[PDB]
Ligand binder design. Structure first.
Ligand SMILES: O=C(N[C@@H]1[C@@H](O)[C@H](O)[C@@H](CO)O[C@H]1O)OCC1=Cc2ccccc2S1(=O)=O
Ligand SMILES: O=C(N[C@@H]1[C@@H](O)[C@H](O)[C@@H](CO)O[C@H]1O)OCC1=Cc2ccccc2S1(=O)=O
Lengths: 364, 367
């Protein structure tokens, strides 16, 4: 369960090790700023990758990186590749065509990828949160769930469906993965009770139109500013957090960035704290509506910033407020939102790289 | 693809015939008012043959099914019961673990697989399905029998279809996710997810009807219903029998007393302007389920199913209605990127109990 980020040439030497004369899975975690790519081996799951800059901000650059890797590597090494899986930050169809993306131009095309790294019949392109969901499965299968995930609150259904303590395994029930970061990501780890298998269903929840509660004025305010009917991502993003802060201060303080707002909030600033609560009020609305639509056993909040903002979740007041909002739905009169166990990532981990590898296992 | 509805003693008789001397699947399609239950076999070549008896849910209680199962085990040869390889039923509410169903909004009690006789529900080969989960398996059953174009018609073809397929739209389910919607008494939904890595379709039950409706330019109309219900409206409140009745009341404005959803559809078929407008309003909200789900679930196809959909073909047959629905399906901020236009919409155009076919089709994966 461990990953070292190495130089390209260090990597080449690492794979020359006897401990890497085994079948290999090629993996790639592609962001809009940079991309980490490398290999994973076998009861240990070990990965070493190297990083590239998405300098041109064009998804087709990946091809050059692939080619370079094949060049700066011995055929003994390459010939061991049994699977190749990458993830990209946009919708993907057929597991083979990714994009368009709003951070990058171009289209990820598996058919254009080198087959030394992407063996035919053993390769895939994933959506980033698709990979992330596979990552969650990987953590659960490594028996290390409680090390990376903390229970925010246990739902009504957990103890009936599961014998293990909440937070100690993923559970034999649907898990909705949400990643409120740059973009708002979402995937459903569906559980098939007939074959007892989990499958990862990519979703675009963030782009749904926000349904109201008692906030028509606040939504119209954003609508007027965006010139678009607000979707969840508009409220639950960096840009969303900046919006919430400006609406709190009313011009009494200068406008700050998301990172800065979050930093201030950690320092204890009331304006920034109010901003974070507003943001999470809308994140919980994604949860309450999806709790009904998708009937999950668990909802898991993932991503670096979820870990780096642990301070917000540890605060029992905030937690209580988020819980109240998670149950703010008409169907809670029947207990639907109460059914669901909410968890948060509490320790850093690249779920996406682990997910690429695990997806590879279902292929090979 | 065929189902015959018989009497209990009648049913009991035909199962003693040589055609039925084959492994059987016990199935049951359970509704608020009635339940159809019986046996299904594979036929030549890819065909499916069901023999069922009607049961009225007179006690409005889901646990009465238990009595029915008993009545079938006692009153039927043990030689027939021995042929039972799987047992699958569907119920009109959410199901957890394929074993615990309910609660239901039109029936009392909880459907419990553990409380069912093992004779009709063999251990390891049995399940309780949500009705639209069974419906989704039924859509697969039609696809598997090469008869998709007999039961489903294209309303409009989406951008993505030809990108993924050479055959014409409506001729196959297609190698992509299929969202099944059933606007009937309640609004049903399931996603036939498509896993492109193993080319497998898998049915994922949903409760899209109970989501709060997001707005377009209709805040006053949503608020009008809010004031009647004392609840923020969900899609089912606008798309259901009660929803159609509300739309009719809003169209007429007291000027005519209220009539039933069924009465309203009949009037619409006879060209009554007010009922037609009510039906248009109903479909405006159904298309909003569609547009939002088109984004959230990224489906290749959306299929409207149910006796309702079939019997009200007069509505979909009309080009003006279809054009107004199409427009509403595209009414979403994300259509500026073409997401809603990607999707092909289809409708059931021939009566078939998808649920019974689905219970059978699900039973195949268990046996
Ligand atoms: O990219 C998206 N959705 C993405 C998801 O796939 C991804 O899992 C998460 C997290 O990385 O971020 C979302 O934003 O949808 C397509 C587009 C949304 C959007 C928003 C504003 C402008 C353009 C576009 S788009 O590229 O059509
Ligand atoms: O029953 C449900 N949902 C059902 C679905 O499972 C089903 O597929 C469709 C189609 O038949 O009907 C929906 O209504 O959700 C739970 C309930 C909703 C509801 C609405 C009003 C009163 C009570 C209740 S409930 O039984 O909690």
């Amino acid at each position: 369960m461990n990953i070292k980020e190495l130089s390209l040439h260090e990597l080449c030497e690492e794979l020359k090790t006897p401990a890497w004369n085994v079948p290999l899975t090629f993996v790639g975690d592609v962001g809009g700023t940079s991309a980490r790519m490398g290999f994973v081996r076998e009861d240990s799951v070990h990965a070493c990758v190297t990083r590239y800059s998405m300098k041109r901000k064009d998804i087709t650059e990946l091809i050059e990186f692939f080619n370079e890797i094949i060049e700066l590597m011995p055929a003994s090494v390459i010939k061991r590749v049994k699977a190749g899986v990458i993830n990209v930050p946009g919708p993907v169809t057929g597991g083979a065509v990714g994009g368009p993306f709003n951070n990058l131009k171009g289209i990820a095309r598996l058919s254009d990828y080198p087959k030394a790294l992407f063996p035919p019949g053993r390769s895939a392109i994933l959506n980033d949160l698709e990979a992330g969901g596979f990552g969650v499965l990987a953590v659960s299968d490594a028996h290390v769930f409680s090390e990376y995930f903390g229970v925010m609150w246990e739902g009504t259904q957990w103890r009936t469906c599961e014998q293990e303590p909440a937070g100690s395994v993923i559970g034999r029930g649907r898990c909705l993965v949400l990643a409120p970061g740059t973009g708002l990501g979402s995937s459903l780890i569906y559980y098939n009770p007939m074959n007892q298998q989990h499958i990862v269903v990519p979703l675009e929840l963030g782009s749904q139109t926000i349904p109201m509660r008692k906030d028509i004025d606040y939504i119209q305010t954003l609508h007027a500013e965006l010139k678009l009917l607000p979707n969840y991502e508009n409220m639950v993003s960096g840009a969303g957090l900046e919006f919430h802060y400006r609406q709190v201060v009313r011009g009494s303080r200068p406008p700050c960035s998301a990172g800065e707002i979050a930093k201030l909030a950690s320092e204890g600033d009331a304006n920034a704290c109010k901003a974070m609560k507003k943001y999470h009020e809308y994140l919980m609305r994604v949860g309450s509506e999806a709790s009904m639509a998708l009937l999950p056993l668990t909802i898991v909040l993932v991503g670096d910033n979820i870990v780096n903002n642990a301070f917000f979740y540890r605060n029992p007041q905030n937690l209580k407020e988020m819980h109240r909002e998670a149950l703010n739905h008409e169907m809670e009169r029947f207990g639907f939102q109460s059914r669901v166990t909410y968890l948060r990532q509490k320790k850093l981990l690249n779920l996406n790289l682990m997910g690429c590898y695990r997806c590879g296992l279902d292929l090979s």
